[PDB]
Amino acid sequence: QVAMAFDMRLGLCELESERQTFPLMGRYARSFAAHRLVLVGDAAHTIHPLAGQGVNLGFMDVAELIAELKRKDIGQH
Amino acid sequence: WDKDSFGKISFSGEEFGFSHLGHIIENPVIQQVLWQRASQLSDITLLSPTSLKQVAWGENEAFITLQDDSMLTARLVVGADG
Amino acid sequence: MQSFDVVIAGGGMVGLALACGLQGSGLRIAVLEKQGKGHALRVSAINAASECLLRHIGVWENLVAQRVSPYNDMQVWDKDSFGKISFSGEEFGFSHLGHIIENPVIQQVLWQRASQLSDITLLSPTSLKQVAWGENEAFITLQDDSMLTARLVVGADGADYGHHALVANIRTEHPHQSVARQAFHGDGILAFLPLDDPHLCSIVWSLSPEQALVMQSLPVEEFNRQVAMAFDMRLGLCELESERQTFPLMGRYARSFAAHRLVLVGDAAHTIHPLAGQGVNLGFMDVAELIAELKRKDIGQHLYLRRYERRRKHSAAVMLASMQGFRELFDGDNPAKKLLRDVGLVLADKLPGIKPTLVRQAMGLHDLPDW
């Protein structure tokens, strides 16, 4: 079934590992600011046009956050 | 087979002792062949190239006519292949 | 009998265009026709390519001096995605994209040319009683038992659909300013074709048969209201002047049929087109190419003909692909695309620059043979 859904692009297929599922907790969120609270989304588990790339959105959240934080009061919303 | 569900069924007559399920045959060959049989039969005559000018459906005869004004009659009429 | 090189069933715009044109060719032409000064109900939006056919056949000056309504500017939009594209030839140095011209004027004009030509005689009011398709002659006959023969026969202007068109003359609050306007709304399309009167348009409203029928039978104050909303009030309050007329759009999966000494050209005057009022242009282009091909072997044999058929069925697929393409373009002009434009991550979009391509299509200066 995996191979047909892939057009047989790589021929016959064989699962080695266990099969694991997890909800894609995108797509309408990734940030929450609050009075001395910052939330960054679980980008590791979020939808993206490019497979396996969600976490990049997180690494980019924090780079920008590193940038902004290294200056007033760090916490004020 | 189906490209969406990936469902598929395959089958053979050989599995049930048959040599063929059918034959692919060109239409011109089929028709020109049955045409040759047609005039190789005497209770059949072939009228061509002929188009119909009028048909007056009678109770006992067909009373059809031809463009070349050759009157024609028939018990029953049957149309096909168009 | 009388003997002709080509007889032409149903002599309307396109067949006569063929008559004047398929000439100075050595071919004798017969033409079978089986049958005011106010704004006609029926108008066609004649493009530059079509103009070059009519200017060539010497008739342009005529219906110009009659009544002609130049547009150089066009606007198309969609009421659902709010997408819209507008364009002009002036932007590329052209004075006009086309002309709105009344059908009766066009045809009565080409009719006058017809008998002002001696290799053309006109047979009317005449209907066919019998045609016996011979190997070398047409052997067709008339109801008045006048035998007739022809090398090749060609039918046009009449002789399956999806939508109907409601057409009518509509006075608008705001001047149309010589803009051909077209609005998509679901599976309704509503076009306003500008006329001589600075405040009058002839519309083409493509609707389902059931929708066209209801609109045609609506009381006028309701029609006035309803037409204007479907047009986004682009020209303000609306008032029907003329009668409301509907006719099936006999596109879209045909326009050509070749056969043993038979050529059929579609009733392009009644066929779907991306650009409202433009169907007939497809017909004028069918015949130009046919004039071109006919003026040479045997004129009638369905061998030197089916290659002509290829070209036309081809053109009809192109027109179909184009309507599909206008819809894709409008449904793609949405807010997510706007966001991506801004941020530079658009993969697929309106091309640089479709304005010039929209102009070459409206003018239809492609499609031409030259000559």
UniProtKB/TrEMBL annotation, chain A:
<protein>
    <submittedName>
        <fullName>Monooxygenase</fullName>
    </submittedName>
</protein>
<comment type="similarity">
    <text>Belongs to the UbiH/COQ6 family.</text>
</comment>
Automatic annotation (TrEMBL), chain B:
<comment type="similarity">
    <text>Belongs to the UbiH/COQ6 family.</text>
</comment>
<protein>
    <submittedName>
        <fullName>Monooxygenase</fullName>
    </submittedName>
</protein>
